Assembly symmetry: C3
């Protein structure tokens, strides 16, 4: 199934009939960082498997719902269970839910992820406002836009220089200052490691040489599809560990340690993003 | 359809019957840089769609012809509408037209493209003689030769150290000097960005650190197929912008600005390449 | 055919019936470096084509056998004819023979390859104990683990920081010292070039900047599948040439020169690895 205008329209038609909500904000939440979705008001939960043309997700299993409703007086749509390219999903499967968001009316997309720190100023539990990226799959002929262009959504050759909206970064920081946790908030350049293996110690050292501040396995595909079709983006990484320190000390990382950092910061990130949604222009 | 000896031979048989031209020079021209093809003498235009085993190009659309005839007394074959890997074409689809050129008798392939400048000496409207490359798809398991080797055309493990013929670079420069536009002509290393998104500002900064002089989304696949089967190559980039300056000043690039630079230099590039063809040993 | 638990089990059942050998050591030998396999005692040769669910290898041709028997009193299984990803094999085809080794009882995997030198201390004929890697396909969404996770074998997100066992490196060096050829033995970081073209001169220069000591087209996929399922690894590169010196002097590399270096060191590498196998804890 191609992520074209006709197919995205069929999915949006189904959703509109079921939910009655017309959202102008979309959210995609990182693993362990999804509690805000359970607090959406007057909500409607729609399993992916019920939506025409949505990608099949049963091989990987686990949760996969679209959730619509209200947060802070604003109308939103959330992806509960996000699709990652290291699972083997195609470019078309990743893109279609974002293009459905566009047809539903979404103008702003807020994204969180879990990442490794490369910059020596970054500690476990810090947040990074993403200001730019280094897309190793894209340089290497695995960009999410490889294929025919879908002209109704955007141009053949997108410019990504303003993919991460500057005013949304400023608003996120302002709210951190109001609540006295600005000491946790940095900005930086995100390296996309296709995954699913964590960056090796020598890959971490390479990324330091190349000007990367953080590294992770998600987010850049969604950012590119959003930018292509004119949706503004705020993306925030939660730092689980510093990969450069771990390489110097011969210390391992694993998914259990990552999820424990997510639990440690989940409630603060929930409160922060509720207020960002409330305050969006 | 595999780019093997039998399939390429069937396409060459059809072409020979229709054109009567036996070329020893091939040309592939960048977007907006194709006017020379309309000036081929006593020419024959053959739509791709009519040639046995040529790749299907109707999803992307636009022009796609092989053109045979004479330029400056020399017999040539041109691709009018080139195939780019960011459109989703496979390794086999890219390779077959070049291997058909080989079977038709081509010994020299001349290529132009549009590119971004990384080296700080490069300005919009400059030309770069390509002397080597950094192939990010090739390092990342998307080399155009991934697959079975077609032994009739070349070896399993090609050496690319002399892929860009030194004497052809010298001839191109000599002609620029004769016409007093040598101040526009540089040499440099080409980085292949698979595309179709322009390099991000932070990817540009990375490419500067890594010794790249220019960046673009084409050319390296064709160069590798040509070198594999013993065809000499001259490749010239037209610089549309300097990506490093644009990153420092927060200035965007887009396809409209690129095509306007092509129009500005099209007639000079036409004259230059007509004389290169005339003067080839 | 997916490299899952059921399919690997069917292949292991066939092998056990035919060979009666229960190995705890596996070996994969580089091109020209396979003579040890012909000296396995009381051996059993099993063509891949006869084993249920083994990948089809007839397009590439050449030898492809599993060989079981005894070396130095130890029970081993060898791959005679290894699968390389530049031939077009999928992730699933590469992984299944290693997962069969696991089900047969393999706890240690010994690997050799032919490689290019990047570090200026490396000469033709030197050996490099691999201590870490830079996986360009993995960064670029062509990691051997892209796809569904096979949970019975290992975790969704592996840590590769101890993929190259430190005590096995120490044992290999100790044996070199006992036989007075330690002057040939280095340690270093391996860059995976997907291939099949040799690294270009400008790619070599880039790899020097990025902290790579050697470059080659194999090994990292097998290491990752082994680490995922808890198999310890020793990997040794034979240096055929120094790519950085060749770039400064404009000297070519080719497969004939590579195989001649293999022949020059084959008997010493055979003796070394026979003793490593004998001495494994």
């Amino acid at each position: 199934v191609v992520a074209n205008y006709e197919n995205a329209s069929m999915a949006a038609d189904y959703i509109k009939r079921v939910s009655n909500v017309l959202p102008d904000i979309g959210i995609i939440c990182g693993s362990g960082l999804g509690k805000l979705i359970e607090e959406i008001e007057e909500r409607k939960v729609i399993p992916y498997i019920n939506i025409p043309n949505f990608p099949k997700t049963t091989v990987a299993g686990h949760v996969g719902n679209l959730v619509l409703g209200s947060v802070g007086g604003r109308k939103i749509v959330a992806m509960q269970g996000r699709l990652h390219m290291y699972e083997g999903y195609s470019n078309q499967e990743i893109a279609l839910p974002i293009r459905v968001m566009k047809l539903l009316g979404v103008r702003v997309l807020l994204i969180t992820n879990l990442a490794g720190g490369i910059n020596r100023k970054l500690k476990s539990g810090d947040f990074v406002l993403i200001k730019g990226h280094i897309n190793f799959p894209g340089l290497g002929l695995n960009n999410v836009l490889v294929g025919p262009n879908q002209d109704e959504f955007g141009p053949r050759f997108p410019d990504l220089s303003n993919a991460y909206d500057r005013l949304l970064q400023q608003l996120a920081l302002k709210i951190a200052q109001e609540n006295d946790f600005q000491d946790l908030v940095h900005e930086g350049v995100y390296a996309f490691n296709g995954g699913p293996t964590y960056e090796s110690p020598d890959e971490s050292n390479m990324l330091l040489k190349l000007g990367c501040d953080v590294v992770g396995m998600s987010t850049v595909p969604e950012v590119i599809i959003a930018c292509h079709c004119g949706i503004k983006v705020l993306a925030v990484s939660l730092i689980a560990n510093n990969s450069i320190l771990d390489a110097e000390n011969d210390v391992s990382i694993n998914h259990e340690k990552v999820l424990a950092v997510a639990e440690k910061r989940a409630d603060l990130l929930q409160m922060w993003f509720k207020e960002i949604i409330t305050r969006l222009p």
